[PDB]
Design a protein around this ligand. Structure first.
Ligand SMILES: NC[C@@H]1O[C@H](O[C@H]2[C@@H](O)[C@H](O[C@@H]3[C@@H](O)[C@H](N)C[C@H](N)[C@H]3O[C@H]3O[C@H](CO)[C@@H](O)[C@H](O)[C@H]3N)O[C@@H]2CO)[C@H](N)[C@@H](O)[C@@H]1O
Ligand SMILES: [Mg+2]
Ligand SMILES: [Mg+2]
Ligand SMILES: [Mg+2]
Ligand SMILES: [Mg+2]
Ligand SMILES: [Mg+2]
Ligand SMILES: [Mg+2]
Length: 150
RNA sequence: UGGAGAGUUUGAUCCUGGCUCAGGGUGAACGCUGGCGGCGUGCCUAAGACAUGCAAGUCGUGCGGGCCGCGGGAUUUUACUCCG
């Protein structure tokens, strides 16, 4: 079992004859702090059920994060829709310098030392999806070598 | 060895997009408050106007004097005059 941080919860609303009718969404990261994180987005008529639903979804949605001493192999920019995330390696003693959303994700993947910047649409959902892709897309000297053989 | 973002357009959503804030800085000023020291710093305006004192002189080993004194001489008549 992993840690489960909740980034964003919000109440949405649909219209119906005589009144508005509310739903709830919840963004949840789950991770072990050792190279596995999962992002999950879950909606439901009550907050509780939505958070729970989200964690579940988050576990069905995990990722290889190739740490290298609390940080990442290289720099990556990822655009997701209009949201862009940059992710930069840092020596130790730096911290995770990042906004609320990518930080929670980087924390639970066991990144300890990383420089970020949100560019673009600063939309939480979309920033989180970009952060995931960004991690998702990390390679290392190892796998790159392996890719380039013949 | 270096990079955090948030609030606000909607019933709700995404995007655009402005506005606003959190940070650092100061020859400061204003309020409330005020114990000590060290080191810095102090007319941003009228390059307005200025009382009063002080702020560039020194050299007699370049030169000749004036003025106020004192001493010694040429003089034993008291006027004149040489030197220091
Ligand atoms: N007298 C007060 C004001 O002086 C002003 O003039 C001032 C300026 O001309 C000059 O002041 C200077 C200033 O220009 C420049 N920025 C340097 C420094 N800041 C000031 O310094 C001046 O005043 C300070 C004390 O205040 C003195 O210690 C300094 O030695 C003197 N030069 O000298 C005057 C003061 O010395 C205005 N004339 C007027 O508003 C009024 O005279
Ligand atoms: Mg784009
Ligand atoms: Mg924008
Ligand atoms: Mg409108
Ligand atoms: Mg509204
Ligand atoms: Mg904005
Ligand atoms: Mg002083």
């Amino acid at each position: 079992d992993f840690e489960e941080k909740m980034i964003l919860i919000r109440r949405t609303a649909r219209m119906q004859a005589g009144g508005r009718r509310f739903r709830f969404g919840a963004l949840v990261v789950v991770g072990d702090r050792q190279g596995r994180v999962g992002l999950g987005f879950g909606k439901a008529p009550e907050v509780p059920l939505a958070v729970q639903k989200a964690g579940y979804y988050a576990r069905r949605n995990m990722v290889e994060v190739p740490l290298q001493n609390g940080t990442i192999p290289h720099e990556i920019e990822v655009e997701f829709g209009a949201s862009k995330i940059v992710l930069k390696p840092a020596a130790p003693g730096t911290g995770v310098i990042a906004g609320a959303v990518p930080r929670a994700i980087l924390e639970l993947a066991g990144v300890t030392d990383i420089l970020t910047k949100e560019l673009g649409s600063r939309n939480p959902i979309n920033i989180a999806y970009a952060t995931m892709e960004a991690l998702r897309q990390l390679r290392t000297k190892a796998d790159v070598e392996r890719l380039r053989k013949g």
